[PDB]
Amino acid sequence: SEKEQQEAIEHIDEVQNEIDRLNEQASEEILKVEQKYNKLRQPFFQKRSELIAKIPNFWVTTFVNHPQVSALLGEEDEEAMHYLTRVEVTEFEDIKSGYRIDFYFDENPYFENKVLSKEFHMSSKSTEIKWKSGKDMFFTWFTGADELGEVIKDDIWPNPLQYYLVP
Amino acid sequence: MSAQAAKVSKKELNSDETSEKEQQEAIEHIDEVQNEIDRLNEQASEEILKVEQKYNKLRQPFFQKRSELIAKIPNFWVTTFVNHPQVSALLGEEDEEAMHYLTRVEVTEFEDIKSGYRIDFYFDENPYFENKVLSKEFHSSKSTEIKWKSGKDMFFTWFTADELGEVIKDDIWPNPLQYYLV
Numbered sequence: 001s002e003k004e005q006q007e008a009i010e011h012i013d014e015v016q017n018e019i020d021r022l023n024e025q026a027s028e029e030i031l032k033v034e035q036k037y038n039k040l041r042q043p044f045f046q047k048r049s050e051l052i053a054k055i056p057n058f059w060v061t062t063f064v065n066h067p068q069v070s071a072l073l074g075e076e077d078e079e080a081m082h083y084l085t086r087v088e089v090t091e092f093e094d095i096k097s098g099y100r101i102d103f104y105f106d107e108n109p110y111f112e113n114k115v116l117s118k119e120f121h122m123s124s125k126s127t128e129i130k131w132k133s134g135k136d137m138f139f140t141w142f143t144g145a146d147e148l149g150e151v152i153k154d155d156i157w158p159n160p161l162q163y164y165l166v167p
Numbered sequence: 168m169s170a171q172a173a174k175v176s177k178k179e180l181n182s183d184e185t186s187e188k189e190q191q192e193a194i195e196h197i198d199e200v201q202n203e204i205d206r207l208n209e210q211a212s213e214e215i216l217k218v219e220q221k222y223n224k225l226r227q228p229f230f231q232k233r234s235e236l237i238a239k240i241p242n243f244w245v246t247t248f249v250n251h252p253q254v255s256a257l258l259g260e261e262d263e264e265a266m267h268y269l270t271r272v273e274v275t276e277f278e279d280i281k282s283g284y285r286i287d288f289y290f291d292e293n294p295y296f297e298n299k300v301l302s303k304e305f306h307s308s309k310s311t312e313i314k315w316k317s318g319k320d321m322f323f324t325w326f327t328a329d330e331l332g333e334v335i336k337d338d339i340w341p342n343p344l345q346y347y348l349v
């Protein structure tokens with residue numbers, strides 16, 4: 001029994017080793033699916049970008065019509081957001097590495113930066129905002145950072161029209 | 168006819184046609200592109216579901232075997248829990264004494280046509296309650312009514328949710344052995 005309990009635990013160790021290999025294989029095959037479809041989708045996101053450029057205030061309105069993102073938007077934040085021209089989400093090619101969100105802003109009284117970028121690593125890198133005279137204030141989320149990041153990546157990004165078109 | 172044509176002319180001319188139209192056209196063209204995106208999302212989804220079904224079937228006999236082996240080791244699950252940083256903190260010295268009678272944990276997920284998951288806790292005969300199995304389901308959660316013995320009423324507040332359930336399901340279930348040892 002003291003030996004039998006010992007036999008059982010070695011046997012548990014071996015079964016768990018098989019479990020672990022199978023958990024690893026499943027994760028790898030899933031990740032490859034995501035890597036595959038991230039590549040196939042890229043020409044359509046590019047095209048979709050060009051079309052959104054023809055709808056002024058597309059990204060502001062999309063954000064405003066999203067219950068979670070709106071909770072993140074103060075008065076001046078939303079005014080700054082009027083210079084918001086384009087949002088891109090790019091997942092790193094291997095997917096596991098993380099992703100980046102780019103926010104393009106037209107020339108504005110708030111900051112010098114053309115693009116404000118937030119990167120997520122699997123760790124969080126963001127653009128330093130070159131605020132203009134006395135403008136230093138959403139933009140705090142900029143500097144948990146991954147909740148709004150996931151909302152944009154996973155909710156808004158696949159179908160932003162779902163929010164644009166629905167007050 | 169003259170008066171009718173006058174009304175018609177006024178209506179069609181007098182009664183924007185750059186910016187509005189541009190917008191409306193763009194929206195229709197974005198929808199077209201979305202349809203391509205959605206088909207791709209659906210293909211990926213299907214692919215991931217086929218991968219998940221395959222490895223689920225591969226994994227199952229091993230998790231079955233692992234449970235039967237676990238039942239031969241006294242204290243496996245207390246030791247696993249006491250060694251887990253978040254479950255350990257919820258165990259008083261009492262709940263720990265009770266968990267010595269805990270022979271078996273099962274986590275069963277029903278995802279296909281969502282019904283959440285279930286954790287079943289099997290106990291040998293013990294001084295604290297009558298129940299052979301204490302279960303909890305999370306979809307927001309159903310739980311076994313514990314039939315305490317006589318002033319034995321006591322972690323087991325959990326059966327009166329999300330965080331602990333997720334910990335056991337997501338952390339410990341796939342590999343309890345890393346806590347049992349480490």
Ligand SMILES: OC[C@H]1O[C@H](O[C@H]2O[C@H](CO)[C@@H](O)[C@H](O)[C@H]2O)[C@H](O)[C@@H](O)[C@@H]1O
Pocket residue numbers: 034037041153154157158204208209211212215
């Ligand atoms: O792989 C299955 C998922 O496909 C979509 O999500 C991926 O594609 C999106 C763009 O269409 C990305 O924003 C996202 O990060 C990717 O995970 C779909 O939105 C999901 O519901 C599917 O499960």
Ligand SMILES: OC[C@H]1O[C@H](O[C@H]2O[C@H](CO)[C@@H](O)[C@H](O)[C@H]2O)[C@H](O)[C@@H](O)[C@@H]1O
Pocket residue numbers: 222223224226227228230231274275276277278340341
């Ligand atoms: O298809 C049989 C069952 O597969 C899944 O369950 C197995 O895989 C899980 C992790 O992938 C293990 O945690 C579980 O113990 C295995 O039995 C699925 O969760 C079940 O609903 C399926 O019946």
